């Protein structure tokens, strides 16, 4: 399946200026949009190639999304003071509101899940339920928001976007961005070798330039899986729009040939098996 997701962060800056508001959109693992409220006359801006064509495909796209983000930044600067009062916090400290919303779509452009979720200082605050008719508030302070949103009928407007508009734009981005988004790039894999002592040696299994981010790297010894024994770094961006990961075992010297690295990724034909 494919997903369109937006990530909002807003935070107060006591003693330095107004609150800051940053928005980024993503189709799957590719960022296509940003907004930063700290620019003079902040505009929504393209972060992926196919977005430099939306101006001729939808002549109003930038103006209405700019407008939308600017109102969002204004709404949350007030939301920061509302929520701070809910928790009876002073104006001295900085605090953070985050929002994550978007849609998961399977084949034939059909909606799987919609979601809209908010965090305050990094903890769950309020979330739209899977049925998109209702809200879950994480604590008593967030029930202030729940009652407001329920009375005002906001879940229905959220559902309207998530079911109609979120889906339609996922499709448009997928199609207009076919070459970037619909690709699956295999990893480029190799094994390096570092000894530490004479009874032990580090074997590091590398995966470079793959898209999407989803990947599994597994080390086996004689077919028995070494997951509990290995060192996996968290998958990292390569900076060109793909990702890197490595897995490493420390193995008895001389026995290198009894360890295999299994690599699974969505655009490999078959899971690969590598040795040194």
């Amino acid at each position: 399946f494919h997903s369109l997701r937006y990530f909002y962060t807003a935070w107060s800056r006591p003693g330095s200026g107004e609150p800051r508001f940053v928005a980024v959109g993503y189709v799957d693992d590719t960022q296509f949009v940003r907004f930063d409220s700290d620019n003079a006359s902040p505009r929504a801006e393209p972060r992926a190639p196919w977005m430099d064509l939306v101006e001729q495909q939808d002549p109003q796209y930038w103006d209405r999304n700019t407008r939308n983000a600017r109102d969002a930044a204004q709404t949350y600067r007030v939301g920061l003071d509302n929520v701070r009062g809910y928790y009876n916090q002073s104006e001295a400290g900085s605090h953070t509101i985050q929002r994550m919303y978007g849609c998961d779509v399977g084949p034939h452009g059909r909606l799987l899940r919609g979601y809209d979720q908010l965090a305050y200082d990094g903890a769950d605050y309020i979330a739209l339920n899977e049925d998109l008719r209702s809200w879950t508030a994480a604590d008593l302070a967030a029930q202030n928001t729940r009652r407001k949103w329920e009375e005002a009928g906001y879940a229905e407007r959220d559902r309207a976007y998530l079911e109609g508009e979120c889906v339609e734009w996922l499709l448009k981005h997928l199609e207009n961005g076919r070459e970037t988004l619909l690709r699956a790039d295999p990893p480029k894999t190799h094994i390096t070798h570092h000894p530490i002592s004479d009874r032990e040696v580090t074997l590091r299994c590398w995966a470079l330039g793959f898209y999407p981010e989803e990947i599994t790297l597994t080390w086996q010894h004689d077919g028995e899986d070494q997951t509990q024994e290995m060192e996996l770094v968290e998958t990292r961006p390569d900076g060109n729009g793909a990702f890197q990961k490595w897995a490493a075992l420390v193995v008895p010297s001389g026995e290198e040939q009894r360890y295999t690295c299994h690599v699974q990724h969505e655009g490999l034909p078959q899971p690969l098996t590598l040795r040194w």
């Binding site: 969002a72 949350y76 929002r99």
Partner: peptide
């Protein structure tokens, strides 16, 4: 498009 944003 961005969704609408609702006031906490």
């Amino acid at each position: 498009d961005f969704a609408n944003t609702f006031l906490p």
